[PDB]
Amino acid sequence: APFVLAYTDGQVEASYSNLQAFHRNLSAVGLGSTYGLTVTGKLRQDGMNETTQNIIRFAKSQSLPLYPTVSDYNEDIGAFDPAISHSILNDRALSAGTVKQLVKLAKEGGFAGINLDFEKVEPRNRAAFCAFVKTLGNALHASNKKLIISIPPKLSDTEPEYLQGYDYKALGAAVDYFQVMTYDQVGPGWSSGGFHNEAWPGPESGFDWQQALLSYAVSRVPASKVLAGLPTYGQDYSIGNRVHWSAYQEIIAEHRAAIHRDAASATPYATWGPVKSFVDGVEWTPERAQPVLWYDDAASIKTKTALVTRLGLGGTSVWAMGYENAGFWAALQSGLK
Template sequence: MRTKLSILLLFCLVVLAIPFTANAQVIHKVNAGDSLTKISKQYGISIDDIAKLNGLTVNSHLVLGQALLIPTDNYVVQPMDSIWKIARHHAISEETLMNKNNITSSQIIPGQKLVIPRLPKAPLWIGSYLIPKDKEKNNWMLDNYKNTLSGVFVFEYRPDANGNIILVEENEAHLLAWRKQLVPYATLTNITEKGFDPDLTHEILNNASIRKKLISNIYALLDSHDYKGIVVDFESIKNEDRDSLNLFAKELAAKLHPVGMELMMAVPPKEGDRIPDYSAAYDYETLGKYVDRLFLMTYNWHWPGGPSGPIAPINKIRDTLDYAVSVVPRSKLMLGIPQYAYDWTINGEDKDAKSYSIQHAIKLYTKTESEIHFDEKAATPWFRYVDEQGDPHEVWFEDSRSLLAKMRLIHEYELAGMGCWHLGITMPQTEELILAEFNILK
């Protein structure tokens, strides 16, 4: 999560409704002339329920291409729909859709109802990063999301160059988590005033005495705070430190495992052992031998400092999973899911993108009446708008279509876990889809 610092500064807590119990999976793409009233009548679902589930108000103006999650199994065919398009946006095959509805022809007509089949729920361990607030807000977040989580990763502790750990004011987040049957983990990063700092990790990992001291301090932190384990999120590590990182994981696991403590590591996406070359320090196969879970940071293919584009394109995620399952047991793999949007200024000037919650992106495209486009190759939505200064912007984000497609990869690859960055910024559709797709392990 190389952009966590900017995200941390820009994200705000978004108050969300408690997820529905219907666990819907019908996705309706807004067409010309659509309104919440019209859609409500089409599906026989109240305006309040549709609005609440999609993070809208009952008076919200809908925009072309917007994806709405509808709490029903019956999809109403829209003008310009096709079997391919409906199947694609529900992450199923055309054959599956046709068989479920006992139809042999791909010819469909507007107003026709099609049952959208559901997959059997799979057991899944789900964790999410938690940026501690005050005790009251910590309690609210954990309460609101507890039904869709197995554990939380308290963000974040940091080592100094001597192997000491800089503590975070977590305001009893770990205690509150235990009380709500959520397993708390401490997150350890290599963030300094420079951002993710490869020089800091180089110094720690290659000095045996400092490395040993840090491991001892990690153990002491977990023991004193009653954490179940540690999530090591060392990013931008130098390729020359590959063997040292492997050794650190081996030694840390040897310290934690005998007493039942767990080790997780967050790693960047890769398509091969040294593909891309700048991530060669992360040896999936060797790290996979020592960790309890490997958190795949399958996002940020486009980031604030680069050109605009999809944050987590489905085709690139597939490439990562194809490699990961070939060298790491599926029982240890966690798919990382982004829960944020990037907003690029695209007027040719050298400007970083802004990061904010998906819910903010929804409010923005509603306010600016921006049409939502969907990149079929990346399975990701995006839109453009012009700000008050006249500058054009391009925003890439996630919606129910892109999230469902990612969750279906968990079924397909038989992964054991999923993780999100971070609590408090998800949209209601995320929790609804999780409950529809998985049985959450506790």
């Protein structure tokens, strides 16, 4: 049976109300936008609020496994920060203290384990990250807890260079699940991995891109540990901002948009005027705004989720519960069947 992991965005109230409705779809909940580690090696839960407290209580009531998702997101600046991993990984005391805090959290909180979400590990810290994750996985396992790691997806053992701080083989060996963050392929200002002719606007999570990234993942990590990733958000290029799955058809209806679809990415988009394209590294600006929403629908979610079966993956993962509706989960299940 596929392992289906939903990350709740604790900063949106709908994460809790959605869980109440959609919990049966899930194998586990990753508690998102809540927990982080600091440059000083402190575990924080400064994102904690009543929404997430309610999610925790509800999941426990349903015997649904919970994983705090502990990130290198710096709340002072609202961004993922390489300074956090650079500090913790290279200091013996900070590394050890981080591990103990994480085990304490999992034990005292009655959680199934920890989802490590360090997104800004640099290539200079590759060996140090392997050492840390090995220690963390061992410590959690010794306390009868599990470890999931979230991974910014790379193309190969060598590409891109900036992601070579992540040793897929070693990290895969240390964890229970290897969650591949197959989203944010293209957005206002960027286009990743050499796909989509390095143009934006484009897909949040293209099929061709996912297939390449997941094919690489299973070549280094046992496929049964690998989780695909799906976004429940898209990009409105007229305003340069993310929009939620629940709002896609509202945006389309407001603009009387014309629905279209891209073959290579198997991703729908809706336009309400002529669209010009830019390239990776050319920033979105109001002057460069385009009348197009790149989104997903039942057909695209079904097609993308078929990769779980095709590649023999252990399951899939969703960022985030709180942005979606019943139709998203119906489409996901239709692709797992």
